[PDB]
Amino acid sequence: VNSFSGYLKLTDNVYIKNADIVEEAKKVKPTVVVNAANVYLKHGGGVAGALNKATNNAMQVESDDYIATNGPLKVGGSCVLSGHNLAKHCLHVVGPNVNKGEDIQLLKSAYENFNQHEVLLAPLLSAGIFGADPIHSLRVCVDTVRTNVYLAVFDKNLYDKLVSSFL
């Protein structure tokens, strides 16, 4: 038993809700919140900009030190950093950005990072300003992640479409 509430169950291990991931994280304080990161951990917009803003820019400060030490992530890769006031940990995961021409097949590799964590609160990778089809992202999620994932979908219209079209 965990503290996630109001989720619709899609499969044995995948759950979904129309919610702002920032507010969901603030209330649940999950062990892991996933950020929709880029390889530079520059948290300007989308989910990343919103999560970072909620940490009063502490996420960005920590991220800049990480990059200065380690260099950029790989597309499809991840790193574990602090969750600040939102979670114990933040798993920064880089899905391919279609608006940069990155290979969509890397979306499966991105979701594989979730399997290193028993339970996660996460957005749909490569959705929103990353330009991929969210219906496809949900399918890859369900077919790749084996650990327990609670997906927060900000837009109510998209949430309804994702549920109604789910196979």
Ligand X SMILES: O=C(NCc1c(C(=O)O)[nH]c2ccccc12)c1ccc2[nH]c(O)nc2c1
Q: Interface with ligand X by CB under 6 A: which residues?
A: 20-22, 36, 46-47, 50, 123-124, 127-130, 153-154
Sheet holding 32-36, edge to edge: 8-9, 14-18, 148-153, 119-122, 32-36, 89-93, 78-82
Minimum CB distance to ligand X, residue 117 (Å): 18
**N- to C-terminal Cα distance for the chain?**
26
Closer by beta carbon to ligand X, 95 or else 117: 95
Of 1 and 56, the one with the shorter C-beta distance to ligand X is: 56
User: Which residue's C-beta sits nearest to ligand X?
Assistant: 128
Which residue number, 22 or 81, has a Cβ lying nearer to ligand X? 22
Q: How far is the CB of 83 from ligand X (least distance, A)?
A: 16
CB of 67 to ligand X, least distance (A): 19
